[PDB]
Chains A and B, each alone.
Chain A
Amino acid sequence: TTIVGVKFNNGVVIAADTRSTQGPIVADKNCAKLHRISPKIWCAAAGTAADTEAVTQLIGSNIELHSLYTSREPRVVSALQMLKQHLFKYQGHIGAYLIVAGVDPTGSHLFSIHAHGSTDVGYYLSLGSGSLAAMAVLESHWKQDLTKEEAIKLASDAIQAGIWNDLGSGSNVDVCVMEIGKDAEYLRNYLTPNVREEKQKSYKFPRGTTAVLKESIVNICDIQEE
C-alpha cells in the first residue's frame, strides 16, 4: 500500500493507491483505502485490510455518537485519541497503520498512527510498503505555504512513486481534500494510469461447449398461495 497525507494553506489532503494483495496475488485492483470517520475526518489505511476497515468503522461510529451527545462537530484529535487507545490495547495484533486527517473547529490536522498505538504529527506523511518511494518524492518536492492544487499534485505524485516502484502498490490513485470552511471532496479514482489494454482475442465460447449432466429450476421464492 502507499498512503500519504499533505498539509496545505487552508487544509489537508490524503491519497492512496487502490491495490490489495494476498501473498503475491492481487486480490482487488480497485479497493477504497480512504475511510470516512466523520464527514470532515478521513483516513488513509495500510496494513491488514479487515483491521483497518473495522477500526475506522468502530471509531467512526463512536465519533458520530460523541458528536450527537456533545452537539459539536467532531475533532481529529478525538478520532486520534480513540484510535491510539484501541490499537495500544491490542498490542499490535490489530494491524492498522493509518494517516488520520481532517478539519474541525480547531483548524486542519494531519496525523499518522501505527498498529502498536504510537502517533506522529507532520506536514507530510507516508505509510505502507510504498512509503519509502512516496517519502522520497515528498522530501524532494514539499515546501511550506503550498496551495490546494500544488498539494493534490504532490500527494498524487507521491502515490505514483509507490504505484510504479513498489510491488505492493498499484492501479489507481484516490484523493480526499479537506479544506477549512468547505465540504470535504472525495475524489475516487482521481488518476487511472493503469487501464488494461485491449485483449488480442475474445474467448467467448460456442454455446454447448460445456458438457452438462443435469438441469433444474431453483425455487428462490417464499411459500406460495392457493
Chain B
Amino acid sequence: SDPSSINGGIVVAMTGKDCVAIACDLRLGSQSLGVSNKFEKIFHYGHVFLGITGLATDVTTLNEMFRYKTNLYKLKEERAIEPETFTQLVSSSLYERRFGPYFVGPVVAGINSKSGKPFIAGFDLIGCIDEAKDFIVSGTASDQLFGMCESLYEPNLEPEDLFETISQALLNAADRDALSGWGAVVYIIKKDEVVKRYLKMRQD
C-alpha cells in the first residue's frame, strides 16, 4: 500500500578527502518475500553517480529517463554533465511530476571534473535538494543510516578509510531493517579512478 516500502532498499553517500563514496544494498522484495539478491540501485552517467531507493519500477524508470536526458545533454553540449548540473536536472524532473510523483529517494554523488570538488546531494520524492558536505541517506533504513552516519562520520577521510566508514554505516543500518540488505555494493570515487566492491553481509 505505502509505495516507498513495498520493495525495500537503501542508499548512502559520503564525502572524504578528494573523493566520494556511494553505497547501496541489493535486495528487491514484495513486502515479506525477498525476490532478487542482485537488484542494484546505483547508476552512472559518465562520471556522475545516481543512487535511487523506493518503488523499484520508478527506480528503473528514472534510471532510463536520466540515461536518455544525459545522452542528449552530451550530444548538444559536447561534454559530460557535472554533478551540480545533474542535481538540478533531477530536481526539475521530479518536480514536473509534483501531483503524481515518482516514489523515490534519489542520491547524487561525484567529483566536479573542472574544480575537483567532491559533491553529494539528496532529494525528497518531488525534488527538494539537500546538498550536504558530510553525507546523504535514503531508503527504508534511513533513520538507521542517519544514526550510523552521524556517529561514525568524520571529515577528510582517505578513500580506503572512507570505504570502511560508509560500509559499516550501511551494513549495520541494514541489519536493523527487515526490508534492506541481502548484499551490498560500495563505489569509491576519485577524480580518475572508480573502484566498486561487493560486501559480504548477513543474508537474512
Whether A and B touch (Cβ < 8 Å) is answered with yes
Contact with A along B160-187 (1 / 0, CB 8 A): 1101110110010000000000000001
User: Which of A25, A210, A222 touches B168 (beta carbons < 8 Å)?
Assistant: A210
User: A212–B168 contact, CB under 8 A?
Assistant: no
Interface residues on chain B, number (Cβ under 8 Å): 42
| Nearest chain A residue, comparing its CB with the CB of B162 | A204
Given contacts A93-B99, A204-B154, contact A215 B129 (CB under 8 A): no
A10 to chain B, nearest CB (A): 34
User: B95–A54 contact, CB under 8 A?
Assistant: yes
User: A216–B196 contact, CB under 8 A?
Assistant: yes
User: Which of B130, B152, B165, B200 touches A213 (beta carbons < 8 Å)?
Assistant: B200
**Is B32 in contact with chain A by the CB < 8 A criterion?**
no
Q: Interface extent on A, as a size class?
A: 20 to 34
User: B198–A49 contact, CB under 8 A?
Assistant: no
Given contacts A28-B130, A214-B197, contact A207 B164 (CB under 8 A): yes
**Is B142 in contact with chain A by the CB < 8 A criterion?**
yes
User: Which of B91, B128, B168 touches A209 (beta carbons < 8 Å)?
Assistant: B168
Question: CA–CA, A163 to B197, complex, Å?
Answer: 42
Given contacts A212-B199, A220-B44, contact A28 B164 (CB under 8 A): no
**Is B194 in contact with chain A by the CB < 8 A criterion?**
yes
Contact with A along B58-74 (1 / 0, CB 8 A): 00000000000000000
User: In the complex, which residues of chain B have a beta carbon less than 8 angstroms from the beta carbon of A215?
Assistant: 195-197
**Is B54 in contact with chain A by the CB < 8 A criterion?**
no
User: Which of B127, B143, B187, B199 touches A210 (beta carbons < 8 Å)?
Assistant: B199
**Is A211 in contact with chain B by the CB < 8 A criterion?**
yes
Residue among B164, B171, B198 with max Cβ neighbours from chain A (10 Å): B164
User: B198–A213 contact, CB under 8 A?
Assistant: yes
User: B164–A20 contact, CB under 8 A?
Assistant: no
**Is B126 in contact with chain A by the CB < 8 A criterion?**
yes
Question: CA–CA, A94 to B126, complex, Å?
Answer: 12
User: B143–A25 contact, CB under 8 A?
Assistant: yes
**Is B132 in contact with chain A by the CB < 8 A criterion?**
yes
Given contacts A210-B164, A210-B199, A212-B200, contact A204 B157 (CB under 8 A): yes
Question: CA–CA, A203 to B142, complex, Å?
Answer: 20
User: B160–A218 contact, CB under 8 A?
Assistant: no
User: Which of A20, A54, A209, A210 touches B130 (beta carbons < 8 Å)?
Assistant: A20
Question: CA–CA, A218 to B126, complex, Å?
Answer: 30
**Is A50 in contact with chain B by the CB < 8 A criterion?**
yes
User: In the complex, which residues of chain B have a beta carbon less than 8 angstroms from the beta carbon of A204?
Assistant: 154, 157, 161, 164-165
- Interface residues in A28-61 by Cβ distance below 8 A to B read 28, 31, 48-51, 53-54
**Is A22 in contact with chain B by the CB < 8 A criterion?**
yes
Inter-chain pairs besides A51-B98, A54-B98, 4 sampled, C-beta below 8 Å = A93-B99, A207-B164, A214-B197, A220-B46
* Chain A residues proximal to chain B, CB less than 8 Å: 20, 22, 25, 27-28, 31, 48-51, 53-54, 93-94, 199, 202-207, 209-218, 220, 222
Jot down 27 A-B pairs with beta carbons below 8 A, ordered by A: A27-B122, A27-B124, A49-B128, A50-B91, A50-B94, A50-B95, A53-B91, A54-B127, A94-B98, A199-B154, A205-B161, A205-B165, A207-B160, A207-B161, A210-B167, A211-B199, A212-B197, A212-B198, A213-B199, A213-B200, A216-B196, A217-B195, A218-B44, A218-B187, A218-B195, A220-B46, A222-B46
Closest 7 pairs between A and B when the two form their complex, measured CB to CB:
A211-B200, A50-B128, A49-B128, A205-B164, A218-B194, A210-B167, A50-B126
